[PDB]
């Protein structure tokens, strides 16, 4: 049996998001890519360095906003810009969000030497696609 990225059936009580409900054979059929850059296009360079950066950013944001992220990040690269789109919860105070956005945008811009923006979208609770 295949295992890769398959949330397995429970008793019908496990809430899954839309991304977590779709196995890898749906990645260009029902769900899209969580990162969009040019590295993996034919004749394009630096796929390796883009990959390491994405892995770091997903770890950085998970620990920088502990317990706030409601789904996976969407990383966007346009020219020199990097845009991180995160769906967060409405539990942490707004003052703490603004502090962390100013902190993460500055720290990451100096680390990867490029303008970085963080676009937060808040949800009251985790969006449940189905109960598995």
């Amino acid at each position: 049996k295949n295992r890769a990225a398959r949330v397995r059936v429970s008793k019908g009580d496990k809430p899954v998001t839309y991304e977590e409900a779709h196995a890898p054979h749906y990645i260009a059929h029902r769900k899209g890519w969580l990162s969009l850059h040019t590295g993996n296009l034919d004749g394009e360079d630096h796929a390796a360095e883009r990959t390491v950066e994405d892995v770091f950013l997903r770890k950085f944001m998970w620990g920088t906003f502990p317990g706030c992220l409601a789904d996976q990040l969407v990383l966007k690269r346009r020219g020199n810009q990097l845009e991180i789109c995160a769906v967060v919860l409405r539990q942490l105070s707004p003052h703490k969000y603004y502090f962390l956005v100013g902190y993460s945008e500055t720290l990451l811009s100096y680390f990867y030497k490029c303008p970085v923006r963080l676009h937060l979208q808040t949800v009251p609770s985790k969006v449940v696609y189905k109960y598995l």
């Binding site: 409405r90 603004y98 502090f99 720290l107 100096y110 030497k113 808040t122």
Partner: protein, 565 residues
């Protein structure tokens, strides 16, 4: 593209949970974001190693770590220059002393640069990331000690010392040093003369005529030394002339007329100082009226550039005078000037921007048609500023004057969205206006829904933690609004609140409760109306009871009513 009126300023996160919902949150949300940026910068400069891998092409110098520590450890004049460039007041002074003790030669230019650093900062370390009243100049300061040590003292050395003393409120000491400067037959620069003008006015408390003579004498010294005045020379004169409220008006105009003749173009700061001088607490404002009208005619359609540090204070002062004169056409001219080209950037800090727009919108509501007032309301709020609770009251008053009370429910919704849910003054004004007169059924229903919402706010007050207060007018108004809309059930519950909170019901509330009972024809309810008013000993109750007894009253209830009194 133009400003989006539905959105808050671009600096904020465009999310309903994170968008600022009040004027205070507007300030604090930005301060929190700035704090985050400072914390990140503190880490970047604390651990440069982690941010030294440069992967950017072209290279971005601004995204590299900063090094603030001197990297030359040799004791020499060239190594000292570094500490002065780094603005290390204590390191530089200590090294200069060590250099002098060793006996090596320090150039006059290097010594002058050290004095500039010491004089500007008052021999105190500039603020760093991490490690008002009174005269900041101190007699036992490093600047004075080094100044005497200097073997050769040129004109610039004296100049920077005079400017330092005036900057730090050592006015008398600065004037004494200028006297020494003159004794040495050394010409002073424009900037020293500008500081000296301030010194003479602040130093002594003489009457205007004496101070004016002193200022004029410095200007004559300036001409004698072939020193050409700059814009700041005149702006300091006008700023200094603000203490003498009514004596400097004509002299101040002479200073302005002199500027134009010489060729120095008055900036926004120049006119700011003038209008502040001419606009003192006086009811006529006859002179102020002429000045502002003439100033606005001159400034019409002029694109400005930053010339004086006080250029940002003009618009708030201009709008404040327009509100005092209550001239809407003048206010539109002031705002017109703000909107031409890039003049909007001179509005100033946040508290300046809020004051300007508060005075501007308060004048619109008062002096303009309601249909245009509502357009300004939509364009300015929240995209330009977050309204004060008092500006919502002015808007409600404008709606009353215009007889457009169908908008009152919307104003309440907006007020709650702008952080005025629990403002007592605003809640009482809305209820009073809604209940002041009777309205058609549809408008009466809407007012009942708004009253029910205002009631929920009173119930859910956060002040409850301290104490919960139900004003008498608020309670009376809410009850009347429920009765007029036909929600008698809800109104009957309010009757308990009056006695609970010890609030006296108005006669109009009691007189109108009759019909509600008569339409129902329930004598029991009619007595309840009599019972309450009797508790408060209202004179209308006794006369009222007799009429109720005639209309609808049970025999057994009639006897009890009289004895209860």
């Amino acid at each position: 593209v133009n400003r989006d009126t539905t959105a808050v300023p671009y600096v904020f996160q465009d999310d309903p949970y994170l968008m600022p919902a009040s004027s205070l949150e507007s300030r604090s949300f930005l301060l929190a974001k700035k704090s985050g940026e400072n914390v990140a910068k503190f880490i970047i400069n604390s651990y440069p190693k982690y941010f030294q891998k440069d992967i950017a092409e072209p290279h971005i110098p601004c995204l590299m770590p900063e090094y603030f520590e001197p990297q030359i450890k040799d004791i020499s004049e060239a190594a000292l220059k570094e500490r002065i460039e780094l603005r290390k007041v204590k390191a530089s002074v200590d090294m200069f002393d060590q250099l002098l003790q060793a006996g090596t030669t320090v150039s006059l230019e290097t010594t002058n640069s050290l004095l500039d650093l010491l004089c500007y900062y008052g021999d105190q370390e500039p603020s760093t990331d991490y490690h008002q009243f009174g005269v900041t100049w101190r007699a036992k300061n490093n600047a004075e000690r080094i100044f005497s040590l200097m073997p050769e003292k040129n004109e610039h050395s004296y100049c920077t010392m005079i400017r330092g003393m005036v900057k730090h409120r050592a006015y008398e000491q600065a004037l004494n040093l200028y006297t020494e400067l003159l004794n040495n037959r050394l010409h002073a620069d424009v900037y020293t003369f500008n500081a000296l003008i301030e010194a003479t006015v602040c130093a002594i408390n003489e009457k205007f005529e004496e101070k004016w003579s002193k200022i004029l004498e410095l200007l004559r010294h300036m001409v004698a030394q072939k020193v050409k005045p700059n814009l700041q020379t005149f702006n300091t004169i006008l700023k200094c002339l603000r203490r003498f409220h009514v004596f400097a008006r004509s002299p101040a105009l002479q200073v302005l007329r002199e500027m134009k003749a010489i060729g120095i173009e008055p900036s926004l700061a120049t006119y700011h100082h003038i209008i502040r001088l001419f606009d003192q607490p006086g009811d006529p404002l006859k002179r102020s009226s002429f000045i502002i009208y003439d100033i606005m005619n001159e400034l019409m359609g002029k694109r400005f550039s930053p010339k004086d540090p006080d250029d940002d204070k003009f618009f708030q002062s201009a709008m404040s005078i327009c509100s005092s004169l209550r001239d809407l056409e003048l206010a539109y001219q002031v705002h017109g000037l703000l909107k031409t080209g890039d003049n909007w950037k001179f509005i100033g800090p946040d508290q300046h921007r809020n004051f300007y727009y508060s005075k501007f919108f308060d004048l619109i509501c008062l002096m303009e048609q309601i249909d245009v007032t509502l357009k300004w309301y939509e364009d300015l709020i929240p995209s330009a500023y977050f309204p004060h609770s008092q500006t919502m009251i002015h808007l409600l008053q404008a709606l009353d004057v215009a007889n457009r009370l169908e908008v009152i429910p919307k104003i309440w919704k907006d007020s709650k969205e702008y952080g005025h849910t629990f403002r007592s003054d605003l809640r009482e004004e809305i209820l009073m206006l809604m209940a002041r007169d009777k309205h058609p059924p549809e408008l009466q229903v809407a007012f009942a829904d708004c009253a029910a919402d205002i009631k929920s706010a009173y119930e859910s007050q956060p002040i409850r933690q301290t104490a919960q207060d139900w004003p008498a007018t608020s309670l009376n108004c809410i009850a009347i609004l429920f009765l007029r809309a036909g929600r008698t059930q809800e109104a009957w519950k309010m009757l308990g609140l009056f006695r609970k909170h010890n609030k006296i019901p108005r006669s109009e509330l009691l007189n109108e409760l009759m019909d509600s009972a008569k339409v129902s024809n329930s004598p029991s309810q009619a007595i309840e109306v009599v019972e309450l008013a009797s508790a408060f000993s209202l004179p209308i109750c006794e006369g009222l009871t007799q009429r109720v007894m005639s209309d609808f009253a049970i025999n057994q209830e009639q006897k009890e009513a009289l004895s209860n009194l």
